[PDB]
Design a protein around this ligand. Structure first.
Ligand SMILES: CC(C)[C@@H](C(=O)N[C@@H](C)C(=O)O)N1Cc2ccccc2C1=O
Ligand SMILES: CC(C)[C@@H](C(=O)N[C@@H](C)C(=O)O)N1Cc2ccccc2C1=O
Lengths: 162, 162
């Protein structure tokens, strides 16, 4: 089900959040670390239903950001649906220490034949969100590879359509 | 998470199934009624992981259909993941008996302002799969409207990206 969240604006007068209009709906594109957004448990992928009571259905990215910018008081209220496009998939590394997919800009671009990823039916055109609980949104590809490399045999990732 | 299914080829030498390659993965596009696919509970949206042991990752629509066509013997085995893109949303009709969205060819094309659909954050470019348990895949728009009309106030629908 959805849920309500109350959060306050920081010194610089922001919440550390980017919103994207996708199919006439507003979605969290990035949540900056240690921000008011972070504390109340907002994460990349969350759907924004209302902002201060008003429905977001139909709003552009620009409209959604302009509402928050001129939003009145200390406290903004938001009705959220938790990552509705969330898919978790558990994979196992082979002898070479690989689960078997290629990615660019944190998005899966190809699957390796007869790998663990192929076995479990991983899909391309999906962004990597987490790896074993560690959020990888807004990291460089090399930083993602480090996390993959420093993982154990069991590799659980969370994905979403691009 | 996944599961195995065994099914036999019918008199006309088919299973009554269409498969579509989506993001280097095979998916059920349509399940013809009273077919071997229908028995054993295949439905539009299911992901095909293996066909007769072999991983489907990377296969084209043509490749996937060609495997089944020349597949040896009475019995085909398939590893399936049940509708992984499934999203349910419950809505309530207004005074005019409307939840507030437009659709064409069983796909949501627009949301009505300040409706129940807007309130609950329904998205366009999503196919309607069920309505209160009733499957509406392969129905005409008018037949869908009948089911909507003959629904009560509470309207639960299942959707998927187009
Ligand atoms: C094996 C390589 C090609 C692959 C990889 O580490 N694969 C993982 C998912 C596995 O199988 O453990 N990487 C690492 C990397 C770093 C920077 C930019 C792109 C990539 C990429 O595709
Ligand atoms: C309000 C009307 C135009 C709408 C509708 O009854 N939808 C409900 C779910 C609502 O608006 O709540 N319909 C009915 C129909 C029949 C055949 C083809 C398209 C449509 C369509 O968009």
């Amino acid at each position: 089900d959805p849920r309500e969240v109350i959060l306050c604006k920081d010194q610089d007068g922001k919440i550390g959040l980017r919103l994207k209009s996708i199919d006439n709906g507003i979605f969290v594109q990035l949540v900056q670390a240690n921000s008011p957004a972070s504390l109340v448990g907002l994460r990349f992928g969350d759907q924004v239903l209302q902002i201060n009571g008003e429905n977001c259905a139909g709003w552009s990215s620009d409209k959604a950001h302009k509402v928050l910018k001129q939003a009145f008081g200390e406290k903004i209220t938001m009705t959220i649906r938790d990552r509705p496009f969330e898919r978790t998939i558990t994979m196992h590394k082979d002898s070479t220490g690989h689960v078997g997919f290629i990615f660019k800009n944190g998005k899966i671009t190809s699957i390796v034949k007869d790998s663990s990823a192929a076995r479990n039916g991983l899909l391309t055109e999906h962004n990597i969100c987490e790896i074993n609980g560690q959020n990888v949104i807004g990291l460089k590809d090399s930083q993602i590879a480090d996390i993959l490399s420093t993982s154990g045999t069991v590799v659980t990732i969370t994905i979403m359509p691009a």
